[PDB]
């Protein structure tokens, strides 16, 4: 109900709205500049692959 999830190519621009909250002009992965939309801050996400934190450890 919060909006459909899509991958982001990049953040094109930023602004503050009338309510003093941050909005982000998003370039959507697979779409051009015409399809760029202003999204509220809480709509942005960082995704990560599941990792085995032990593989990363360095021995000597």
């Amino acid at each position: 109900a919060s909006g459909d999830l899509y991958e982001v190519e990049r953040i094109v621009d930023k602004r503050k709205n009338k309510k003093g909250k941050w909005e982000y002009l998003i370039r959507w992965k697979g779409y051009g500049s015409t399809e760029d939309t202003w999204e509220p801050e809480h709509h942005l996400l960082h995704c990560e692959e599941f990792i085995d934190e032990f593989n990363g450890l360095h021995m000597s």
Binding site: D4, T34, E39, H43, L45, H46
Partner: peptide
């Protein structure tokens, strides 16, 4: 490297 993603507003503000 972390993927960038976001929820799209419907209707949209261009």
């Amino acid at each position: 490297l972390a993927t960038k993603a976001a929820r799209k507003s419907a209707p949209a503000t261009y």
